[PDB]
Design an enzyme around this catalytic site. Structure first.
Site, PDB file in Angstrom:
ATOM      1  N   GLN A  61      36.324  46.481  39.919  1.00 59.72           N
ATOM      2  CA  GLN A  61      35.956  45.783  38.696  1.00 59.72           C
ATOM      3  C   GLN A  61      34.780  44.918  39.042  1.00 59.72           C
ATOM      4  O   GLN A  61      34.828  44.167  40.015  1.00 59.72           O
ATOM      5  CB  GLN A  61      37.054  44.971  38.098  1.00 59.72           C
ATOM      6  N   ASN A 115      44.862  49.400  37.623  1.00 56.39           N
ATOM      7  CA  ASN A 115      45.768  48.456  36.912  1.00 56.39           C
ATOM      8  C   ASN A 115      46.907  49.288  36.349  1.00 56.39           C
ATOM      9  O   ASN A 115      46.617  50.211  35.656  1.00 56.39           O
ATOM     10  CB  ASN A 115      45.056  47.598  35.874  1.00 56.39           C
ATOM     11  N   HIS A 140      50.297  43.152  40.580  1.00 56.90           N
ATOM     12  CA  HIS A 140      50.367  44.630  40.349  1.00 56.90           C
ATOM     13  C   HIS A 140      51.591  45.221  41.009  1.00 56.90           C
ATOM     14  O   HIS A 140      51.566  46.382  41.415  1.00 56.90           O
ATOM     15  CB  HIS A 140      49.031  45.305  40.779  1.00 56.90           C
ATOM     16  N   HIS A 175      32.504  42.384  36.985  1.00 53.04           N
ATOM     17  CA  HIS A 175      32.846  41.863  35.704  1.00 53.04           C
ATOM     18  C   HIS A 175      32.853  40.355  35.732  1.00 53.04           C
ATOM     19  O   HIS A 175      32.435  39.746  36.709  1.00 53.04           O
ATOM     20  CB  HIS A 175      34.179  42.466  35.287  1.00 53.04           C
TER      21      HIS A 175
HETATM   22  C1  LIG Z   1      48.817  37.160  34.461  1.00 46.26           C
HETATM   23  C2  LIG Z   1      47.825  38.363  34.637  1.00 46.26           C
HETATM   24  C3  LIG Z   1      48.341  39.640  34.300  1.00 46.26           C
HETATM   25  C4  LIG Z   1      47.479  40.795  34.245  1.00 46.26           C
HETATM   26  C5  LIG Z   1      46.048  40.596  34.388  1.00 46.26           C
HETATM   27  C6  LIG Z   1      45.558  39.290  34.629  1.00 46.26           C
HETATM   28  C7  LIG Z   1      46.415  38.220  34.832  1.00 46.26           C
HETATM   29  C8  LIG Z   1      45.845  36.850  35.231  1.00 46.26           C
HETATM   30  N1  LIG Z   1      45.182  41.586  34.055  1.00 46.26           N
HETATM   31  C9  LIG Z   1      45.705  42.830  33.819  1.00 46.26           C
HETATM   32  C10 LIG Z   1      47.088  43.152  34.051  1.00 46.26           C
HETATM   33  N2  LIG Z   1      47.574  44.421  33.890  1.00 46.26           N
HETATM   34  C11 LIG Z   1      46.763  45.458  33.687  1.00 46.26           C
HETATM   35  O1  LIG Z   1      47.185  46.620  33.519  1.00 46.26           O
HETATM   36  N3  LIG Z   1      45.426  45.226  33.427  1.00 46.26           N
HETATM   37  C12 LIG Z   1      44.750  44.006  33.508  1.00 46.26           C
HETATM   38  O2  LIG Z   1      43.528  43.794  33.294  1.00 46.26           O
HETATM   39  N4  LIG Z   1      47.984  42.094  34.218  1.00 46.26           N
HETATM   40  C13 LIG Z   1      49.403  42.500  34.330  1.00 46.26           C
HETATM   41  C14 LIG Z   1      50.078  42.775  32.991  1.00 46.26           C
HETATM   42  O3  LIG Z   1      49.911  41.631  32.121  1.00 46.26           O
HETATM   43  C15 LIG Z   1      51.553  43.182  33.310  1.00 46.26           C
HETATM   44  O4  LIG Z   1      51.563  44.326  34.112  1.00 46.26           O
HETATM   45  C16 LIG Z   1      52.281  43.521  32.009  1.00 46.26           C
HETATM   46  O5  LIG Z   1      52.260  42.392  31.129  1.00 46.26           O
HETATM   47  C17 LIG Z   1      53.749  43.868  32.378  1.00 46.26           C
HETATM   48  O6  LIG Z   1      54.402  44.157  31.117  1.00 46.26           O
HETATM   49  P1  LIG Z   1      56.007  44.072  31.077  1.00 46.26           P
HETATM   50  O7  LIG Z   1      56.627  45.077  31.950  1.00 46.26           O
HETATM   51  O8  LIG Z   1      56.341  44.151  29.616  1.00 46.26           O
HETATM   52  O9  LIG Z   1      56.339  42.622  31.703  1.00 46.26           O
HETATM   53  P2  LIG Z   1      55.913  41.100  31.371  1.00 46.26           P
HETATM   54  O10 LIG Z   1      56.009  40.349  32.679  1.00 46.26           O
HETATM   55  O11 LIG Z   1      54.644  41.004  30.612  1.00 46.26           O
HETATM   56  O12 LIG Z   1      56.989  40.703  30.291  1.00 46.26           O
HETATM   57  C18 LIG Z   1      58.343  40.533  30.625  1.00 46.26           C
HETATM   58  C19 LIG Z   1      59.109  39.549  29.802  1.00 46.26           C
HETATM   59  O13 LIG Z   1      60.460  39.523  30.106  1.00 46.26           O
HETATM   60  C20 LIG Z   1      60.823  38.147  30.080  1.00 46.26           C
HETATM   61  N5  LIG Z   1      62.070  37.933  30.791  1.00 46.26           N
HETATM   62  C21 LIG Z   1      62.045  37.830  32.124  1.00 46.26           C
HETATM   63  N6  LIG Z   1      63.293  37.694  32.551  1.00 46.26           N
HETATM   64  C22 LIG Z   1      64.151  37.699  31.457  1.00 46.26           C
HETATM   65  C23 LIG Z   1      65.520  37.594  31.430  1.00 46.26           C
HETATM   66  N7  LIG Z   1      66.422  37.493  32.440  1.00 46.26           N
HETATM   67  N8  LIG Z   1      66.008  37.633  30.149  1.00 46.26           N
HETATM   68  C24 LIG Z   1      65.137  37.743  29.087  1.00 46.26           C
HETATM   69  N9  LIG Z   1      63.836  37.924  29.123  1.00 46.26           N
HETATM   70  C25 LIG Z   1      63.334  37.894  30.359  1.00 46.26           C
HETATM   71  C26 LIG Z   1      59.627  37.292  30.292  1.00 46.26           C
HETATM   72  O14 LIG Z   1      59.708  36.007  29.719  1.00 46.26           O
HETATM   73  C27 LIG Z   1      58.561  38.160  29.730  1.00 46.26           C
HETATM   74  O15 LIG Z   1      58.034  37.814  28.456  1.00 46.26           O
HETATM   75  O1  LIG Z   2      44.928  38.326  39.737  1.00 47.49           O
HETATM   76  C1  LIG Z   2      45.217  39.051  38.567  1.00 47.49           C
HETATM   77  C2  LIG Z   2      44.309  40.289  38.407  1.00 47.49           C
HETATM   78  O2  LIG Z   2      44.897  41.201  37.441  1.00 47.49           O
HETATM   79  C3  LIG Z   2      44.136  42.414  37.409  1.00 47.49           C
HETATM   80  O3  LIG Z   2      44.737  43.381  36.648  1.00 47.49           O
HETATM   81  C4  LIG Z   2      42.840  42.126  36.744  1.00 47.49           C
HETATM   82  F1  LIG Z   2      42.171  43.303  36.672  1.00 47.49           F
HETATM   83  C5  LIG Z   2      42.074  41.200  37.663  1.00 47.49           C
HETATM   84  O4  LIG Z   2      40.835  40.992  37.032  1.00 47.49           O
HETATM   85  C6  LIG Z   2      42.890  39.913  37.897  1.00 47.49           C
HETATM   86  O5  LIG Z   2      42.840  39.074  36.740  1.00 47.49           O
END
Ligand SMILES: *Cc1cc2c(cc1C)Nc1c([nH]c(=O)[nH]c1=O)N2C[C@H](O)[C@H](O)[C@H](O)COP(=O)(O)OP(=O)(O)OC[C@H]1O[C@@H](n2cnc3c(N)ncnc32)[C@H](O)[C@@H]1O
Ligand SMILES: OC[C@H]1O[C@@H](O)[C@H](F)[C@@H](O)[C@H]1O
Ligand SMILES: *Cc1cc2c(cc1C)Nc1c([nH]c(=O)[nH]c1=O)N2C[C@H](O)[C@H](O)[C@H](O)COP(=O)(O)OP(=O)(O)OC[C@H]1O[C@@H](n2cnc3c(N)ncnc32)[C@H](O)[C@@H]1O
Ligand SMILES: *Cc1cc2c(cc1C)Nc1c([nH]c(=O)[nH]c1=O)N2C[C@H](O)[C@H](O)[C@H](O)COP(=O)(O)OP(=O)(O)OC[C@H]1O[C@@H](n2cnc3c(N)ncnc32)[C@H](O)[C@@H]1O
Ligand SMILES: OC[C@H]1O[C@@H](O)[C@H](F)[C@@H](O)[C@H]1O
Ligand SMILES: OC[C@H]1O[C@@H](O)[C@H](F)[C@@H](O)[C@H]1O
Lengths: 569, 572, 86, 90
Positions: free
Chosen positions: A403, A544, A499, A405
């Site tokens: 990336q 990602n 990741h 960016h």
């Molecule tokens: C923080 C971050 C994350 C990503 C990027 C940048 C940054 C700073 N950029 C990014 C990412 N992924 C990509 O594919 N491309 C990018 O450019 N990031 C990762 C991405 O954001 C995650 O992979 C994705 O959300 C995962 O989705 P998910 O599998 O639905 O999981 P989440 O963590 O988003 O949501 C889970 C959810 O469940 C809740 N929770 C946790 N434990 C419990 C329990 N016990 N009971 C009930 N609910 C629970 C959490 O509160 C949460 O909302």
């Molecule tokens: O450290 C979290 C990383 O998540 C990745 O998915 C994003 F591509 C990066 O730019 C960075 O924000």
């Protein structure tokens, strides 16, 4: 009583809700966090006018909702306390630290987000497809049919996220970087826009996608969907799924309402866990899958022995660069410039549509106007030019994602127009000794078994490739400009890339593929339990992972639709 | 969106919400505009700390605050970066980069000053301290009758406290809080009095406090609704208010010009009454952009004709800060009533006390908490329970110590020592109003919202302000030592000017525009104008050390009484 | 001439030094008004690395140190690849 | 060339630093805005502490330094003495 219960309101849980609410099932979703993106429930927090005008501030929002998974006991020596202050005699367990954690085999950068919409309320929105080398098999022994399956699922997942590759095409900075890189690699690598889950609204505002984009999280029935049934319950900690004695079916979800303090036992036909790669594994282990406690190979687990083993997290290298004098001069290559800026004789002109211009008229009109209207400014790039969003995707000869960016999650005196971020992400071999496990004695802030990592990047190919990846970033970045002081080439803390994969991994055969879920994301042996997320991914990947996770989720929902009937409305 | 309202309010902070509460309640057709957006959750304008997750992870809220504090005026950066590669583009001068303000003297700034653009304004993240001002810090509302003045303030402050749900006993079961309160009480016996910080907050459980905000004051839902079927209120977020249009006579406002930031369109809105509650900085910007005071670098050669004191006589508090590590004597005192047998971790280890014993130094509830912690966590070397709430202590401003004090734990920090041992000290000085201390707006440079760029010309006055400030530092050093030594990395220091975010006097109140060098009267009405009102800390004309919000709300309630007595609500 | 937790036996320093084209405009001159500690005319520089070959080589040099050093080990955190002060 | 420095080589950095006197230091423009209100406070970035007002900070050799001791810099140098090949040599 519900047809379907989903644990977590992240983008993966929202994919299950989109598919299953739409198909007529009575769906409940629970999230341990609360609604906090505004009136669009689970939307991206970056989609305010104020953040898009002050983007340097959004790093703080991210940091505010990244809660570290496992912090080892602190052993920093503070020996300049006053003599009168209470002074410790040992390095005792202070401040939420985990005594089970070896500080030298951790993923210290690993963190979780407890908010409705999960990490999609803050993410970067990069949604590349995995190529065959990174991608798990959905069909064995027929590459064509496997490719057709993935192409279908990824196309649908791109639609849900509103993935596009055109939103940044009118950025001068973006084009300047892309064009230089394609020239320098003489066809050996392809550069394109990072595929991004986003819709541009104006030249200065992008509507970044989120969980909300996938599914709006509004309770149903409502005027827009009068025949659909959906209820979201925030501030509900999901603690265990109850197994029947046969280990063939889940009979209930045990929940803790955080506002009232009460505990309840919820019944569904179908249970979906989408709580993230860490928290899905926590819930399963709190439920009698896998093994609770420090791993003990003398007492192998009876259910899902592969749970929490073969964990993968990517190596991440990062730097920032300051654009080269040659590139900045190339911005204004079509201009005829006379005189000295600020003086009455000064002029900047170009000929519209000339076939010998390097740049199209839009570009030259921007640059001319910037230079004539802002003669105090020494750069030819307009003030509001959007950021670069460039990638060369993972390939056998450069097995890392890239990336090039501007990320809101950075890690002042140089003009921002000149600055470009570089993030290269390595693939990690799945090894049985790389583990996420849960303490049998230490608990987390929600009274659940405390997560503990036992992780090192595997020697051999993972480590060789990580270092080759760092060299490749150093070599590529130099084509654009030198490093920015204070953002020198470095490996980032393990897990800061967020990741994490393989914690509840997918395969065709539980024993032969050392896995926990099948290609329908169904937990082996169980008729009605499904897991979604990056934990399902069993391969070594560098791109990602979210889009790939969502694609697996769509396939899981198809299985559900083929095997469970919705209750009548 | 209609064209005509009875009342328009600019800004949805707690002062804007005070006007909404009072006028929506009295039957006026009200519209409110905010340049920022709804983000706090389904409770519009609520405190962002009021989540289960933040209250289990309070160390992370600092980031929420930092993410929504946008600096007012950033000078041109002159840092030398001479280790760029020779191929990188390299500046020949310190040119205007990255949003900096070339009008700003870096040496006469309030560098810490910042603003918050979100629905509910700063009340979505504030510390919720709401003390009253004593007479010495407070503007007169009744001349020549001190008792009547005191009675009027007491009436207003009582009502403001109710709006904010101000209380002084939310922290009374904290061991840390009482340990520190009692020690200071004892040390200054007959010299100074200590109490709980008055806090706009309602405890919900031993581990959760519902912190107040704009939403406590007024819930910001559109009305009519099922619970308020005869009320009329519309909130319009993402609307930049740019100008109030004057008649030629400068006797009345004729419209409000607004910029819808989503569509990009501009509109005129008509009201009978116009209330500006955009904060101390942004009220002043809006007025200057509308022809009041003087646009551009101050020029005594050309004084303005309308509101010549606008932007002058500005005050901001000096702030001193440190953190301490609780003394061994104090920690030992927590467990003074315990009988201890054996060594922790052994089968016969025993920590006991005698309930009701007349020789105990602490109540039974305290000893029960201690004893249970020490028996249930024998690996832990402190007698303080893990869940114990933070201290929230003050000695209020007095003439012999003319500064406000907070002895507390603030989310807005500025990890190896145990958190139970750590106490924050913040002492806030009063600043004399001086004509030469100014907030002015560029006639050439604009901000992110294409509005005239705010610029400060500020120094703390020599004489009393400066002498007090230094005496204040000394006092924090003297006092804090009674509790423990300084925390390394949080040693005693002045904080950046304006970081305390207590800016006042930018549109100040007085009885007479000329004799009192002021912009609004005691009903907060702009002199000369029949239907224009300003609210907020910009109204405060005095040198104050205490936190100003409650004072400002009190003046807003008084303003609302004038409005209700002089304008008629339309029929539904 | 450095510019403590990792064992010293593991640590290797890399210094790569570029050649600079002589250019008339790169000057050391002395103040006619300001003096130094020894009351001698104060030295003043007017220097930039020449564009063209000096600058291209310098950056190629950085890349080369990065490529070469990787054969021996990764960078030491807090001693990452950098240009030093001129 | 002392027994002590060669048993404690990490400390010789300080010997070098103690005898490298900067050639030309530009006028300092760092903003210190947390002085107490009673301390004397500058109105401008005046020439302080040996700085050279003639020096453009952006066209300097800031690292250049000299050594005034008998034996000059050879009392602390790294002792690398390569020959130049024709391409580097007059
Ligand atoms: C923080 C971050 C994350 C990503 C990027 C940048 C940054 C700073 N950029 C990014 C990412 N992924 C990509 O594919 N491309 C990018 O450019 N990031 C990762 C991405 O954001 C995650 O992979 C994705 O959300 C995962 O989705 P998910 O599998 O639905 O999981 P989440 O963590 O988003 O949501 C889970 C959810 O469940 C809740 N929770 C946790 N434990 C419990 C329990 N016990 N009971 C009930 N609910 C629970 C959490 O509160 C949460 O909302
Ligand atoms: O450290 C979290 C990383 O998540 C990745 O998915 C994003 F591509 C990066 O730019 C960075 O924000
Ligand atoms: C950030 C913060 C603030 C305070 C404390 C701690 C910190 C970290 N703690 C604290 C405070 N005050 C106290 O009395 N006790 C304490 O413990 N803090 C300050 C307090 O938070 C403020 O004094 C109070 O909110 C001011 O209320 P207000 O007068 O209603 O102003 P706000 O800034 O809250 O809201 C203004 C509002 O108007 C909007 N806006 C601005 N410009 C425009 C334009 N042109 N058009 C439309 N709307 C506009 C803003 O977006 C905002 O919401
Ligand atoms: C400090 C240092 C120097 C070098 C290396 C490492 C570091 C930290 N390593 C190194 C060097 N050179 C190499 O070829 N190989 C390496 O591994 N360093 C540089 C080397 O040390 C110098 O190039 C060499 O000494 C220069 O020799 P010189 O021409 O004899 O000059 P010096 O600076 O040594 O001695 C000058 C001398 O004159 C005195 N002085 C100055 N002004 C006056 C006036 N007006 N009156 C009288 N005397 C004067 C000085 O006091 C000094 O002793
Ligand atoms: O129109 C100006 C030029 O723009 C350049 O970008 C094109 F490549 C040329 O073919 C010509 O169209
Ligand atoms: O720095 C802003 C400050 O505002 C004041 O109101 C609070 F009392 C302080 O504790 C601090 O948060």
């Amino acid at each position: 009583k519900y047809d379907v219960v989903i644990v977590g309101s992240g983008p993966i849980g929202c994919t299950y809700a989109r598919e299953l609410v739409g198909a007529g099932y009575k769906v409940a979703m629970f999230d341990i966090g609360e609604i906090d993106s505004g009136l669009k429930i689970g939307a991206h927090k970056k989609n305010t006018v104020e953040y898009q005008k002050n983007i340097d501030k959004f790093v703080n929002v991210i940091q505010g909702q990244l809660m570290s998974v496992s912090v080892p006991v602190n052993t920093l020596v503070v020996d300049t306390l006053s003599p009168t202050s209470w002074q410790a005699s040992t390095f005792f367990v202070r401040n939420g630290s985990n005594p089970e954690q070896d500080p030298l085999r951790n993923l210290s950068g690993q963190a979780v987000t407890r908010v409705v919409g999960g990490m999609s309320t803050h993410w970067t929105c990069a949604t590349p497809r995995f190529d065959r080398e990174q991608r798990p098999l959905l069909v064995k022994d027929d590459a064509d049919a496997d490719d057709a399956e993935w192409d279908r699922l990824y196309t649908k997942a791109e639609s849900y996220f509103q993935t596009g590759t055109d939103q940044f095409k009118e950025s001068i900075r973006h084009n300047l970087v892309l064009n230089k890189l394609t020239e320098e690699y003489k066809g050996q690598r392809d550069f394109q826009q990072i595929p991004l889950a986003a819709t541009r609204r104006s030249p200065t505002f992008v509507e970044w996608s989120s969980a909300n984009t996938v599914f709006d999280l509004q309770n149903r029935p409502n005027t827009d969907a009068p025949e659909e049934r959906f209820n979201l319950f925030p501030a509900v900690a999901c603690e265990r799924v109850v197994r029947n004695a046969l280990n063939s079916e889940i009979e209930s979800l045990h929940i803790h309402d955080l506002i009232s303090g009460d505990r309840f036992e919820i019944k569904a036909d179908v249970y979906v866990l989408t709580a993230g790669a860490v928290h899905n594994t926590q819930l399963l282990v709190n439920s009698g899958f896998g093994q609770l406690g420090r791993p003990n190979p003398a007492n192998p687990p009876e259910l899902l022995p592969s749970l929490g083993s073969y964990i993968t997290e990517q190596s991440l290298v990062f730097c920032q660069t300051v654009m080269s004098t040659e590139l900045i001069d190339s911005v204004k290559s079509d201009m005829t410039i006379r005189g000295t800026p600020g003086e009455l004789t000064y002029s900047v002109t170009y000929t519209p549509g000339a076939s010998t211009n390097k740049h199209p008229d839009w570009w030259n009109e921007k640059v001319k106007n910037h230079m004539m209207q802002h003669q105090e400014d020494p750069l030819p790039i307009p003030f509001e030019d959007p950021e670069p969003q460039v990638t060369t995707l993972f390939q056998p000869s450069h097995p890392w994602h890239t990336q090039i960016h501007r990320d809101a999650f950075s890690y002042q005196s140089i003009d921002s127009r000149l600055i470009v971020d570089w993030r290269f992400f390595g693939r990690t071999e799945p090894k049985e000794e790389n583990k996420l496990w849960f303490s049998d004695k230490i608990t987390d802030a929600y009274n659940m078994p405390q997560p503990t990592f036992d992780f090192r990047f595997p020697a051999g190919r993972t480590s060789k490739e990580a270092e080759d990846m760092m060299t490749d970033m150093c070599v590529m970045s130099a084509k654009i400009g030198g490093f920015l002081p204070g953002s020198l080439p470095q490996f980032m803390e393990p897990g800061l890339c967020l990741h994490l994969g393989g914690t509840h991994r997918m395969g065709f055969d539980e024993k032969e593929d050392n896995c926990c879920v099948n290609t329908d994301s169904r937990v082996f042996g169980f008729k009605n339990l499904f897991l979604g997320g990056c934990g399902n991914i069993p391969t070594a990947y560098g791109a990602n992972p979210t889009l790939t996770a969502m694609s697996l989720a769509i396939k899981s929902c198809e299985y559900i639709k083929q095997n469970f009937t919705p209750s009548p409305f």
